[PDB]
Each structure stands twice: as C-alpha cells, then as structure tokens.
Design a protein around this motif. Sequence first.
Motif, short mmCIF file in Angstrom:
data_model
loop_
_atom_site.label_atom_id
_atom_site.label_comp_id
_atom_site.label_asym_id
_atom_site.label_seq_id
_atom_site.Cartn_x
_atom_site.Cartn_y
_atom_site.Cartn_z
N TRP A 161 10.86 11.84 12.45
CA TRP A 161 10.68 11.66 11.03
C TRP A 161 10.18 12.96 10.43
O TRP A 161 9.38 13.67 11.03
N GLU B 86 5.94 18.12 6.72
CA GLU B 86 5.34 17.16 7.63
C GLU B 86 6.42 16.54 8.51
O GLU B 86 7.54 16.28 8.06
N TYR C 30 1.42 8.38 20.51
CA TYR C 30 1.47 8.06 19.09
C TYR C 30 2.25 6.78 18.92
O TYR C 30 3.28 6.59 19.55
N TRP D 216 2.47 2.73 16.52
CA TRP D 216 2.11 1.84 15.44
C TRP D 216 1.88 0.42 15.93
O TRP D 216 2.47 -0.02 16.92
N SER E 128 4.84 4.73 5.80
CA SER E 128 4.62 4.06 7.07
C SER E 128 5.91 3.41 7.54
O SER E 128 6.95 3.49 6.87
N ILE E 129 5.83 2.77 8.70
CA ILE E 129 6.98 2.06 9.24
C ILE E 129 7.40 0.89 8.36
O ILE E 129 8.45 0.29 8.61
N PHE F 114 -3.49 2.03 4.98
CA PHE F 114 -3.65 1.48 6.32
C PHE F 114 -4.64 2.34 7.08
O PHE F 114 -4.86 3.51 6.73
N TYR G 226 6.70 1.01 17.80
CA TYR G 226 7.05 2.02 18.82
C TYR G 226 5.82 2.77 19.32
O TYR G 226 4.74 2.75 18.74
N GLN H 202 3.49 16.42 16.29
CA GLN H 202 3.36 16.26 14.86
C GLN H 202 3.02 17.63 14.30
O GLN H 202 2.41 18.45 14.99
O1 LIG Z 1 13.59 5.23 7.24
C1 LIG Z 1 12.16 4.71 7.26
C2 LIG Z 1 11.26 5.87 7.87
O2 LIG Z 1 11.08 7.02 7.05
C3 LIG Z 1 9.92 5.09 8.32
O3 LIG Z 1 9.33 6.09 9.27
C4 LIG Z 1 7.97 6.15 9.43
C5 LIG Z 1 7.32 6.78 8.18
O4 LIG Z 1 5.89 7.17 8.44
C6 LIG Z 1 5.80 7.88 9.77
O5 LIG Z 1 4.37 8.29 9.58
C7 LIG Z 1 3.90 9.15 8.55
C8 LIG Z 1 3.70 10.66 8.55
O6 LIG Z 1 2.83 11.33 9.61
C9 LIG Z 1 1.74 10.41 9.79
O7 LIG Z 1 0.77 10.86 10.48
C10 LIG Z 1 1.05 9.75 8.35
O8 LIG Z 1 -0.09 9.00 8.10
C11 LIG Z 1 2.30 8.84 8.37
O9 LIG Z 1 1.91 8.69 6.96
C12 LIG Z 1 6.31 7.31 11.04
O10 LIG Z 1 6.33 8.47 11.88
C13 LIG Z 1 7.77 6.97 10.85
O11 LIG Z 1 8.14 6.38 11.93
O12 LIG Z 1 9.99 4.01 9.23
C14 LIG Z 1 10.44 2.79 8.56
C15 LIG Z 1 11.90 3.29 7.96
O13 LIG Z 1 12.42 2.13 7.06
#
Ligand SMILES: O[C@@H]1[C@@H](O)[C@H](O[C@@H]2CO[C@@H](O[C@@H]3CO[C@@H](O)[C@H](O)[C@H]3O)[C@H](O)[C@H]2O)OC[C@H]1O
Length: 189
Positions: free
Chosen positions: A17, A43, A76, A78, A126-127, A133, A170, A176
């Motif tokens: 991502w 990011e 890492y 969720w 987020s996911i 959160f 996952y 990161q």
């Molecule tokens: O297509 C969608 C994706 O973009 C979604 O992916 C997740 C989005 O948030 C991710 O985490 C963020 C960034 O880095 C972290 O540390 C912050 O706190 C997080 O805000 C996570 O990596 C992705 O998997 O997933 C759902 C989809 O519909």
Amino acid sequence: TIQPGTGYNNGYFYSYWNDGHGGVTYTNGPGGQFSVNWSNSGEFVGGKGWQPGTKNKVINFSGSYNPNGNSYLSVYGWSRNPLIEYYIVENFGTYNPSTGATKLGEVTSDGSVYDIYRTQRVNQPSIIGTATFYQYWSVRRNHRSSGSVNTANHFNAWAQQGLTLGTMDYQIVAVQGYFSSGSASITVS
Ligand SMILES: O[C@@H]1[C@@H](O)[C@H](O[C@@H]2CO[C@@H](O[C@@H]3CO[C@@H](O)[C@H](O)[C@H]3O)[C@H](O)[C@H]2O)OC[C@H]1O
C-alpha cells in the motif's frame, strides 16, 4: 515490481500500500522473499506473510534493511472488531514509533525486551476505510533485521495490559516508510 494491492505470490500473501506519492518500488521475489527500494517516497507499507494471521504464529525473517529516514521493519497486521493496527517492531530508521507514546508494559521475547505502547490514529486510512482506531506496539530494544517473532508472547502481553485484538486480518513482515529513502530485502517464513 507490482502495483499496490494484495494477493498471493509463490504461496505467500502480500500486501503493498502507498499513499500514491511515487518513489517506491515493491518487488515480490522467490518463496517468502520481497524487496522494497524507495527514494523520496510518500507513505507506504509492504510485505509478505499471511491472510489471515493467527494469534500464535512464529514468524521468521531474514535479510537486509537499510532505511535512510523514517521507516520501520515490523511484524505488522490488523484485527477487525475492534479495528486495530499492530506492530512488533524489530528495527527502524530515524524515528522510534513510540516517541511520546504512553508505555503500557514490557515483554521479553526472542532475545530482547520490548516496550509496549498504545497510540491512536484519527481519521486515517485503514483496511475498512478512513477511521479512528488504536495501534498496538511492541518496540524491540535490540534492533535487528533477522530473527524469529513468537507473536503469542506479544499478543498475550498486550491482552494482559488491556490491548485486546479482534478477529485477525492480514499479518506480514513489513517495511514501512514515510517520506524517506531506503532499500530492504527480506525473506519470510
Ligand atoms: O484499496 C483499499 C486499501 O487502500 C486499504 O489498505 C489499507 C490502508 O491503510 C494501510 O494502513 C495505513 C498507512 O500506514 C499505517 O501505519 C497508518 O496508520 C495506516 O493509516 C494498510 O496498510 C492497508 O492495508 O485496505 C482496504 C482497501 O479497500
């Protein structure tokens, strides 16, 4: 190199991502291997592992991790219901992610003491969409780029301190980065 997204590669789930900024190349390699090379990124989070994780997985990782700037190397993943972003941080770059955070205990696992923290993200991706959160952190005192993580020791200590997880989504070893540069090559099992 692959687009951001999720899928399977040589038997391993991956998630990659980014915030769209450009400057990051994520590669899936043989077996459990992935590489990330980035230069003036935005990011991003990418790595290989499992979908879903488990609460007692022993995750092994090995390779090289050369961040230049803000970056983590972590187990890492969720949980859902409650929505939690969690981190077992084995190494990082210029920034300890627990700076300023409230310390909620210690756990000894896999050759180091870890410090435990909870933080909060407010209206962040987020996911499940933009959300507010909690994040759970175990920050390893002795930094490393190879080893084994007995996730049970972390999840159990978190629960002990009132950081409970919901249903696992996952669970990966992830590099990161936030507006930084670097390279990493990591093999998971
Ligand atoms: O297509 C969608 C994706 O973009 C979604 O992916 C997740 C989005 O948030 C991710 O985490 C963020 C960034 O880095 C972290 O540390 C912050 O706190 C997080 O805000 C996570 O990596 C992705 O998997 O997933 C759902 C989809 O519909």
